[PDB]
Each structure stands twice: as C-alpha cells, then as structure tokens.
C-alpha cells in the first residue's frame, strides 16, 4: 500500500507493484 522497502502484495506470479509506507 505504498513505496517503502518491503512489498505489501503480489500478483499471480511475476513481481510486486507496491511496498510499505
């Protein structure tokens, strides 16, 4: 839910689109 260091969520197998905040 943001753009920090750790990913928040993932897609169906590829790469995340978001990070902590």
From the CA atom positions of the chain, what is the Rg in Å? Answer: 8
Q: Are 1 and 8 in contact (CB under 8 A)?
A: yes
**For residues 5 and 9, what is the distance between their CA atoms, to the nearest angstrom?**
12
Give Cα separations from 3 to 10, 14, 17, 19 (angstroms). Answer: 14, 18, 9, 4
Q: How was this structure determined?
A: NMR
Which residue's structure tokens are 């969520």? Answer: 9
Do β-strands 2-7 and 19-19 pair in parallel, antiparallel, or remain unpaired? antiparallel
Which residue's structure tokens are 């197998």? Answer: 13
Q: Are 17 and 1 in contact (CB under 8 A)?
A: no
């Amino acid at each position: 839910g943001g753009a920090g260091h750790v990913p928040e969520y993932f897609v169906r197998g590829d790469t995340p689109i978001s990070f902590y905040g």
